[PDB]
Amino acid sequence: LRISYPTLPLIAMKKKMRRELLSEELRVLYVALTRAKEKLFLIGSCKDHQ
Amino acid sequence: LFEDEYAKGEKAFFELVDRYTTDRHDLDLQFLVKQVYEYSRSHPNPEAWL
Amino acid sequence: FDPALLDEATDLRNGAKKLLEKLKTDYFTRSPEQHLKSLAEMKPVIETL
Amino acid sequence: PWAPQIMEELRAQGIPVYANLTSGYFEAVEVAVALSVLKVIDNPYQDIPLASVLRSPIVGADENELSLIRLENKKAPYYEAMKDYLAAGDRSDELYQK
Amino acid sequence: LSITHSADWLGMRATPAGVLYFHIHDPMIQSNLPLGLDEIEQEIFKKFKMKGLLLGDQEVVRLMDTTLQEGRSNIINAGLKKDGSLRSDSAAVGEKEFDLLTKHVRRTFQEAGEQITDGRVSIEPYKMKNKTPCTYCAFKSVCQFDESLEENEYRPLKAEKDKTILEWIKKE
DNA sequence: CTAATGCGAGCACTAGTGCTCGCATTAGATTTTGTTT
Ligand code: SF4
C-alpha cells in the first residue's frame, strides 16, 4: 500500500525515551559541575543574545 | 545469514525486508538486526527479552 | 493596553493551541480501534524479526 | 568530535593539551602516505596509492613529472607507465633517478 | 544546445520553456491521517513533483500541467492564484534570465578550458554550506591537502539567494 | 523541528475593509556516553 505511520506504542516509547534522555542529560550536567574544586566555567553558543 | 534467508525465500522474510529497507538495498535491515542484538545483550537473558 | 502585554497573552494562547494540535495529531487522527488494528497487524512481522 | 579543533587552537596558543582520542587517525596525511606505500608493496597496480607515494616527499615527483610518466603509456595502469618511463629514460634525468 | 539547434534539428527556432529534474524512486508515504486508496495514490503521485527552473508564464505553466486550474501544481513547482497569475512560490524566471544563465554557462566553459590548457592543476577545494568536493573525491591521498599547512585552504563560497546570483551575472 | 511565506476565507466591525485563522510548503537546520591486556 506504500503507507506508514506510527503505532501507539511507538509514540508512547518516543515520549518515554525523550524524558528519560533529558533526565540523564541533566544528571550528566550535574556530574560535570561537581567535578570542580575551586573554579567553574560554563561555555555555550547561540545565534543571538537578545 | 541474509543470503541463506534470501535462498529459503520464505514469504515472512520478504515481508520483513520490504518494510525495514529502502527501494534500492537492504542495508537498513542489517543495521536493525545489529542494533536489536546489541541492545538485547544488556539483558541478563537476551533471548527471553527478544 | 500595554502593547507588549497584548502580544504576550496572544503568544501564550497560541501556545495552548499548538499543544492541543500536537496532542491531536499524536493520538487522535485515528480511532483507538484503528490504532489497535494497525498494531495487531504488525505482529507477524515482529515475530520474523 | 569537538575536541580536535579545541586542541589545535589551544596548542596554537602555547597551551599544552592532552586528550584520549579514538578517531581522526586515517585522515592524517602521513598515515595516508605510509599506508599508500604499504599498499603499493602489496599490489603496485593501484593507481591512486602509487600516485600518492610518488607525489609524497618519499619520492618528490611534481605534477609535471607525474604527467610525464603518464605520457609514456596512457591506457595502461600507472605502474605500467612508470615501468615504461624507466625502460625508456636515460640515467641522466632527475625524474629517472627519483 | 537544444535551443541553439532547434531550427536546424527540428524545423523552427524555439524558446526555453525550462529545465526539470525527475526523481526516479519508489516512495513511501508517511501520513498522519487515514487515507483511502485514491488519496494514497494521490500522495504517491505528489512525491514525483518535479523541481527545477521554469519560464514565468501562465501559458507555459498550463502547458506543463493541463490539469491545474487554480492553486498548486502536483507536477511542477508552480501554482496559479485565483487571479490566474503565477504564484510567487513558483520556481520560475523570465526570458532574459534564462538567456543570462546560459551565457554564464558558456563563459564558465570557456574560462575553464582556457585554464586547463594553461596547465592549471592547483589544489583548490571549495567549501559551501559545509559541503566540500573532498568528501566524494578518490584523490585525497594524492593531493595530500592539509588545511593546517600554510598555502592549503578551502575556497569559501557564499550560498547567496537566486536574485543575488542573477544580479551578479548581469553585472558581469 | 521550526520559522517564515504566501494565499485564501471568514468573522466582525464601522457591504467593504481589517485582521485573525487556517493550510500548505520550502528553508534552513544538525553533527555520542563505556566495557581487556
Ligand atoms: S580531495 Fe584533494 S583533490 Fe579531491 S577535491 Fe579535496 S583537495 Fe581537490
mmCIF file of C-alpha atoms in Angstrom, chain A residues 4-9 11-12 15, chain C residues 22 26-27 30 34-35 38-39 42:
data_model
loop_
_atom_site.group_PDB
_atom_site.id
_atom_site.type_symbol
_atom_site.label_atom_id
_atom_site.label_comp_id
_atom_site.label_asym_id
_atom_site.label_seq_id
_atom_site.Cartn_x
_atom_site.Cartn_y
_atom_site.Cartn_z
ATOM 1 C CA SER A 4 3.494 4.167 7.043
ATOM 2 C CA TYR A 5 2.527 5.844 10.319
ATOM 3 C CA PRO A 6 3.475 5.462 13.989
ATOM 4 C CA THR A 7 1.581 2.960 16.099
ATOM 5 C CA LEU A 8 0.560 3.879 19.642
ATOM 6 C CA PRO A 9 3.416 2.022 21.343
ATOM 7 C CA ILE A 11 4.678 7.249 20.139
ATOM 8 C CA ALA A 12 4.482 6.045 23.740
ATOM 9 C CA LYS A 15 7.672 10.208 24.738
ATOM 10 C CA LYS C 22 0.236 18.333 18.738
ATOM 11 C CA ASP C 26 -0.118 12.436 18.010
ATOM 12 C CA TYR C 27 -3.049 10.376 19.285
ATOM 13 C CA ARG C 30 -7.001 7.667 14.242
ATOM 14 C CA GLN C 34 -7.833 1.607 14.234
ATOM 15 C CA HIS C 35 -4.710 2.005 16.370
ATOM 16 C CA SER C 38 -2.618 -1.484 12.894
ATOM 17 C CA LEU C 39 -0.712 -2.660 15.955
ATOM 18 C CA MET C 42 2.279 -5.699 12.757
#
